């Protein structure tokens, strides 16, 4: 019964394909609802047109800063920040979808898609979904990153929305 969303991603204007994400609203309803609404844009703002600004091969791809486009911003549907809902889901492997933050209870809009098991983040970042399809597109995104996180191409969420 869980929500499903998509990200269509470009590199320097060239489509890479579609990533389809399941949001675990059965475990983290409040965190899933934020992400879903930021994909649809239904509150008047959201991810469409924003970038994957920090991409580190064999680690993760980070995105969601639609206000500042640089890692310093983003906002949630609940305001600038919202609390950590729970830490029930763990960073079990590639494809995990989890919230970026700046310490406890500072969830906004930024998120990451893991390209490995990032279990040292358990208990610190709220996991709220996982990739169902398009992991090959995530691997293309990953290929445009570097150890520093700097990308070699501008990686844009050219479209996003709900599929469920």
């Amino acid at each position: 019964g869980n929500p499903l969303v998509y990200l269509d991603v470009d590199a320097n204007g060239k489509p890479l394909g579609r990533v389809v994400l399941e949001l675990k609203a059965d475990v983290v309803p409040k965190t899933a609802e934020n992400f879903r609404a930021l994909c649809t844009g239904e509150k008047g703002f959201g991810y469409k047109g924003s970038t994957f600004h920090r991409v580190i091969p064999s680690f993760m791809c980070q995105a969601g800063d639609f206000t500042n486009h640089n890692g310093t911003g983003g906002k949630s549907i609940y305001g600038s920040r919202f609390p950590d809902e729970n830490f029930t889901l763990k960073h079990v492997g590639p494809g995990v979808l989890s919230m970026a933050n700046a310490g406890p209870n500072t969830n906004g809009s930024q998120f990451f898609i893991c390209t490995i098991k990032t279990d040292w983040l358990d208990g610190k970042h709220v996991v709220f979904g996982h990739v169902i399809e398009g992991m090959d597109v995530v691997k293309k995104i990953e290929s445009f990153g570097s150890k520093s996180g700097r990308t070699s191409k501008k990686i844009v969420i050219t479209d996003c929305g709900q599929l469920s």
Binding site: G71, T72, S98, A100, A102, L121
Partner: peptide, 11 residues
Amino acid sequence: XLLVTAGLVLA
């Protein structure tokens, strides 16, 4: 290190 933060990226 390998963290995912929003403002002061740490080691």
